[PDB]
Design a protein around this ligand. Structure first.
Ligand SMILES: Fc1cccc2c1OCCN(c1ncnc3[nH]ccc13)C2
Length: 167
């Protein structure tokens, strides 16, 4: 039993809710919140900009030190950093950005990072400003993630389409 509330159950392990991941994180304080990161951990917009703003820029400060030490992530890769005031940990996961020409096949590799954590609050990877079809992202999630994932979808119109079209 966990503290996630109001989710529709999609499969054995995947749950979905129309919710602002920032507000959801602040309420649940999950062990792991997933950020829709880029390889530079520059959290300017989309989910990343919103999560970072909610940390009063502490996420960005921590991220800049991480990059200065380790260099950029790989597309499809991840790193674990602090969750600040939102979660115990933040898993920064880089899905491919279609508006940069990156191979959509890397979306499965990106979701594989979720399997290293028993329970996660997450957005749909590569959705929103990353340019991929959120319906496809949900399919890859369900077919790749085996751990328990709670998906927060900001847009209500999108949430309804994802549910109604789910196979
Ligand atoms: F860049 C994106 C990368 C991945 C997914 C999404 C992106 O764009 C921003 C809007 N989306 C959100 N989804 C869930 N929680 C959210 N909180 C604020 C925005 C937001 C979808």
């Amino acid at each position: 039993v966990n503290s996630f509330s109001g989710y529709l159950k999609l499969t054995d392990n995947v749950y979905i809710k129309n919710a602002d991941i920032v507000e959801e994180a602040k309420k649940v304080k999950p062990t792991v919140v997933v950020n829709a990161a880029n390889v530079y951990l520059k959290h300017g917009g989309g989910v990343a900009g919103a999560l970072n703003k909610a940390t009063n820029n502490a996420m960005q400060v921590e991220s800049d030190d991480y990059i200065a030490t380790n260099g950029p992530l790989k597309v499809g890769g991840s790193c674990v950093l602090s969750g600040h005031n939102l979660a115990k940990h933040c898993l920064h996961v880089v899905g491919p950005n279609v508006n940069k020409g990156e191979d959509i096949q890397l979306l499965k590799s990106a979701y594989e990072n979720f399997n290293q954590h028993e329970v996660l609050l997450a957005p749909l990877l590569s959705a929103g400003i990353f340019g991929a079809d959120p319906i496809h992202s949900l399919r890859v999630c369900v077919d790749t993630v085996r751990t328990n994932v709670y998906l927060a979808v900001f847009d209500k119109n999108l949430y309804d389409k994802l549910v109604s079209s789910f196979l």
